[PDB]
Each structure stands twice: as C-alpha cells, then as structure tokens.
Amino acid sequence: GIVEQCCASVCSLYQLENYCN
Amino acid sequence: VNQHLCGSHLVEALYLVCGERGFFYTPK
Ligand SMILES: [Cu+2]
C-alpha cells in the first residue's frame, strides 16, 4: 500500500490525495 | 515531482496535500 510504496519505491503527491478524507 | 517518503516524512506530505480535509495514515 501507499505507506510502503512511498517509502520502498516512490509515489506522487497525486497518489497521496487518495488518502485525504 | 516524484517522492521518496519514509516514516514521519510521509505524514508531513499527507498533511500538506490533504490539509483541512484531513487524512488517514494506514500502514500495513
Ligand atoms: Cu528524516
């Protein structure tokens, strides 16, 4: 998931928006 | 631009992106 992907790989701020309420 | 974000640096980015909307931080 995102926590792992952002750290183990890379992620975009657009991918992070999926986690907003 | 792409991001390498571990630990507390990820929750800072979540805070920035989501702001007043708030967010869930849900690791595995
Ligand atoms: Cu650090």
Residue numbers in the entry:
A (entry chain A): 1 to 21
B (entry chain B): 2 to 29
What do the authors say?
Hexameric insulin binds two metal ions by the coordination of three histidine residues (HisB10) to each of the two metal ions. The coordination sphere for each metal site is thus completed by water molecules, some of which are weakly coordinated and easily exchanged.
Primary damage, i.e. photoreduction, was followed directly by XANES as a function of radiation dose, while secondary damage in the form of structural changes around the Cu atoms after exposure to different radiation doses was studied by crystallography using a laboratory diffractometer. Hexameric copper insulin is found to adopt the T6 conformation in all of the crystal structures reported here. The water molecules have been removed from the structures and difference maps have been calculated. At low radiation doses the difference maps indicate hexacoordinated copper in both copper sites, which is in agreement with the XANES results and analogous to the Ni insulin structure. A tetragonally distorted hexacoordinated geometry of copper in both sites is in agreement with the results from the non-destructive EPR experiment, the low-dose X-ray experiments (in-house XRD) and the low-temperature XAS (saccharose-protected samples at 20 K). EPR clearly demonstrates that in the low-dose crystal the actual ligand field experienced by the copper centre in both sites I and II is close to tetragonal and therefore one histidine residue must be different from the other two. In our structures no significant difference in the first water shell around the Cu I site was observed in the four different structures.
